[PDB]
Design a protein around this ligand. Structure first.
Ligand code: K
Ligand code: MG
Ligand code: MG
Ligand code: MG
Ligand code: MG
Ligand code: MG
Ligand code: MG
Ligand code: MG
Ligand code: MG
Ligand code: MG
Lengths: 343, 132, 63, 225, 51
RNA sequence: UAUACCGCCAUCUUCAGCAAACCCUGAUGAAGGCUACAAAGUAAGCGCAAGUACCCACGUAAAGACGUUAGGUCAAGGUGUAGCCC
């Protein structure tokens, strides 16, 4: 019956079953989800199965300066139009079947190490095209509500940095993963540290710190060493602009503490110039590749002290057993110094 | 909860027209009727045939102008005349509109045996009353 | 842009670094005035802690 | 070609003098003493970070060192004048309700702004949403009282630092000056002390604005001929 | 691998610019195959050509 | 097959809460955000409310969100999946 036919919106809403009891409390799987297909896309007004040519609708109104009359495409001509229409549909459908190659992060199904692009521009013609964002963690946290029970939320950790010392991180929370990505990305830009890089490739000195229950021990390294540290640290280092460094993470491997601990240490590192001014003495760099040549890297801007720093016979410094154990060749590990891809 | 003809709140991004934004308990308070005839007056006849004609006309016009209608039809009946007032979009070429007006007016006059007129009002885009 | 980490350094240290890195396109109006006539103490956030054991305040009674 | 000369003769010139606005004459250690600026709270209310500025305790009443107040006040008034000379927006913040009327008048008289009322959350860190996308925030915030009405630091002290806005502040013996850029140790309770602060900051702002008009006028008259 | 995916890259002792990409500019050591991903066959041809 | 759904409804509701977008607090954890002699919240929208119907400003109707019970209905009709076609 013609009077029992509904519209496309009503037909697709029922057939898709997007709003139902099976999509509330994780009651249905995601594999059998079907997609809406607009069936009016390739349809032309006036085109039918009989192939009539209506002047002024399907075909032009006037041809050769004369009003066209009603005509009908020949059988063989209509077959071509029908065959072409099938081909056009297959091509359009083919486009949707094609999978775009997505650059994977740390793992195929992991969000860590994926770029979110540049932060969104501000409302007053502000732009952050130099900054790059990379996800660090995506977690499905839950709370309990009286009405619905389990309420799923997304906690996202992202880090932003232009690669020239300015880098920050923020946490974004939202029901939708897109809203979480946006909030964290835009908020991280307003919380930017500045990291002092020695010769714009490494840290000034070895940093050992403990943030809560996370131990991070970073070592200064020469050029060409590369980033031999925890993967999350590698991502943050590329955003900061550090090219060569080694770091060992111990204790709890909490991503929040690791990130907050890393930015705490790198922010507090003392530069050579800051050392010379505080000590009032020249900072002389001794390089094995340059023999005994004394390279002065920083001099005191103020007056230079004339008394030499007292040389304590035995330094009362706390040594890390792991460092001493390695220098004595007592550390055998089948996992250390393994060949790895360039970082 | 009542469901009849209620567009339900979303995230504040669903544009609704003025008719779609008002539930059935406003049909004589904030919005009017989409059809005006005498069948449903006291002591009047032929309400059933007027309804079947209204249901058909709304489907005929939806399929005859595919993707052009910007809101519901307004069906008017004065004596023998039938007047269809449609708010359409400004996407389809005018030539195609004039063809469809002459075609629908003629085809419907012979189907319901009465003079039928089609009054088109064009809008640049769908008139959004609010965002639900 | 700016940096809202009020617990890391001072407003000048943060601003100066961001201007140097190129994040801040134009230095704020007060920046030049601050540098010319800086305060005696750099305004760095520091946490107040309770005195334990033998620690006492250096304030002396006026007699 | 002309912008650089204008900026150097007007904007950079005052930054080459130690006391371009001559704020030294506005106050002396004697005048501060007569206003009871040295009277601090009892020793039991002392904040640990205010000890470097306390001269001593006279019968368990902290005495603020006016020799430091003079140097601290000199720097605060100098910074205030330079900001007013540069056409900067100065905001006076105070939650002491005994002086709310006085401070609101002092701001209106010197052509500046005052916020003596309940500070709603996000006035500074959420301004573009509260006021509008093109709203301009203050360039200087002068705290005549840095504590709120529960004897804790006024929230704007933290928020001003978040927004990288320099702050001038009168810090009594029970206040926390760690985040105030230009702290001025002094009594913030006695009307005489508060009245003196208002006169000093109102005079420095008015003087600076007038000096800006005089310098600009001279530059323009000379430019033509 | 990087060498085998492009048929126009010829590992020859005369192609000095290509060979330089597989040596550390700061230390002069030839990167081991896991570093760049070249297969053992091409790494052996590269190592010989660099020498 | 109502445990795939649209449509139309029951129920708490003889409720007042659901809230996008921001901001702040928790050392940047799940989360939390009020004090008027005020101490971090600002909040579009939806519901309540207000308006309207009936004989009033009263009362009764109507209205009553987001969600809860995979609550009711493939037998109003339409319809995804599967099955039947002498
Ligand atoms: K069925
Ligand atoms: Mg995989
Ligand atoms: Mg009901
Ligand atoms: Mg006091
Ligand atoms: Mg059910
Ligand atoms: Mg009533
Ligand atoms: Mg009722
Ligand atoms: Mg009501
Ligand atoms: Mg059931
Ligand atoms: Mg049943």
């Amino acid at each position: 019956s013609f009077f029992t036919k509904l519209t496309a919106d009503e037909l697709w809403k029922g057939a898709l079953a997007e709003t139902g009891a099976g999509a509330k409390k994780g009651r249905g799987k995601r594999t059998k989800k079907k997609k809406r297909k607009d069936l009016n896309r390739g349809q032309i007004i006036g085109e039918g199965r009989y192939g009539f040519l209506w002047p002024g609708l399907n075909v032009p109104l006037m041809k050769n300066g004369a009003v066209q009359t009603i005509a009908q495409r020949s059988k063989e001509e209509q077959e071509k139009v029908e065959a072409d229409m099938i081909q056009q549909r297959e091509e359009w459908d083919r486009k949707k079947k094609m999978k775009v190659k997505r650059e994977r992060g740390w793992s195929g199904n992991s969000w860590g190490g994926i770029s979110l692009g540049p932060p969104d521009p501000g409302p007053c013609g502000e732009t952050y095209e130099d900054f790059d964002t990379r996800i660090l963690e995506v977690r499905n946290v839950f709370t309990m509500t009286a009405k619905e029970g389990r309420k799923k939320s997304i906690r996202v950790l992202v880090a932003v940095g232009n690669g020239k010392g300015a880098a920050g991180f923020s946490i974004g929370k939202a029901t939708d993963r897109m809203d979480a990505f946006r909030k964290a990305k835009n908020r991280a830009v307003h919380h930017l540290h500045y990291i002092e890089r020695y010769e714009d490739h490494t840290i000034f000195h070895d940093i050992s710190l403990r943030f809560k229950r996370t131990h991070i021990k970073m070592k200064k390294q020469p050029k060409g060493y590369g980033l031999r540290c925890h993967r999350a640290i590698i991502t943050i280092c590329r955003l900061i602009g550090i090219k060569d460094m080694y770091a060992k993470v111990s204790g709890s491997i909490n991503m929040l503490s690791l990130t907050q601990g890393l930015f705490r240490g790198l922010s507090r590192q003392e530069t050579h110039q800051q050392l010379a001014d505080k000590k009032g003495l020249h900072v002389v760099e001794i390089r094995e590749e340059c023999g005994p040549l004394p390279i002065v890297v920083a001099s005191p801007r103020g007056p230079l002290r004339k008394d030499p720093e007292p040389e304590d016979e035995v330094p009362d410094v706390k040594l890390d057993w792991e460092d001493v154990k390695t220098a004595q060749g007592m550390k055998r590990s089948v996992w250390s110094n393994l060949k790895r891809a360039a970082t | 909860k009542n469901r009849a003809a209620r567009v339900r709140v979303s995230k504040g991004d669903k544009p609704v027209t003025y008719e779609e934004a008002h539930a059935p308990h406003y049909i004589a308070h904030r919005k009017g009727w989409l059809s005006l005839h005498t069948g449903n007056l006291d002591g009047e006849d032929h309400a059933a045939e007027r309804t079947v004609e209204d249901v058909f006309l709304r489907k005929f016009m939806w399929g005859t102008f595919p993707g052009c209608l910007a809101d519901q039809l307004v069906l008017k009946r004065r004596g023998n005349q039938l007047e269809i007032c449609a708010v359409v979009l400004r996407q389809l070429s005018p030539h195609k509109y004039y063809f469809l007006v002459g075609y629908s007016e003629t085809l419907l006059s012979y189907f319901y045996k009465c003079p039928v007129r089609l009054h088109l009002q064009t809008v640049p885009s769908k008139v959004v009353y609010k965002y639900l | 842009a700016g940096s809202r980490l009020e617990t890391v350094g001072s407003i000048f240290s943060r601003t100066r670094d961001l201007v140097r890195a190129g994040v801040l396109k134009e230095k704020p109006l007060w920046f030049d005035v601050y540098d010319a006539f800086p305060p005696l103490r750099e305004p760095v956030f520091q946490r107040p802690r309770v005195r334990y054991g033998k620690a006492k305040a250096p304030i002396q009674d006026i007699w | 070609e002309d912008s650089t000369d204008f900026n150097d003769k007007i904007l950079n010139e005052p930054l080459k003098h130690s006391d371009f606005f001559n704020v030294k004459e506005l106050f002396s250690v004697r005048s501060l003493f007569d206003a009871r600026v040295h009277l601090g709270h009892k020793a039991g209310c002392r904040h640990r970070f205010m000890e470097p500025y306390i001269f001593g305790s006279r019968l368990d009443h902290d005495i603020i060192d006016l020799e430091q107040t003079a140097t601290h006040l000199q720097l605060a008034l100098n910074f205030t004048a330079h900001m007013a000379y540069r056409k900067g927006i100065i905001l006076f913040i105070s939650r002491n309700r005994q002086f709310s009327y006085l401070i609101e008048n002092m701001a209106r008289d010197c052509g500046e702004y005052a916020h003596t009322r309940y500070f709603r959350g996000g006035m500074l860190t959420n301004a573009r949403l509260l006021f509008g996308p093109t709203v301009r925030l203050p360039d200087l915030i002068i705290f005549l009282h840095t504590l709120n009405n529960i004897f804790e630091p006024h929230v704007a002290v933290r928020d001003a630092a978040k927004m990288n806005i320099p702050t001038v502040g009168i810090v009594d013996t029970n206040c926390n000056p760690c985040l105030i850029t230009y702290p001025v140790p002094g009594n913030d309770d006695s009307p005489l002390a508060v009245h003196l602060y208002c006169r000093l900051f109102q005079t420095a702002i008015t003087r600076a604005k007038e000096k800006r008009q005089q310098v600009e006028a001279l530059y323009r008259l000379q430019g033509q001929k | 691998c990087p060498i085998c995916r492009d048929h126009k890259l010829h590992v020859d002792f005369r192609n000095v610019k290509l060979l330089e990409q597989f040596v550390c500019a700061h230390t002069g050591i030839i990167f081991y195959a896991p570093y760049t991903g070249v297969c053992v066959k091409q790494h052996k041809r590269l190592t010989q050509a660099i020498q």
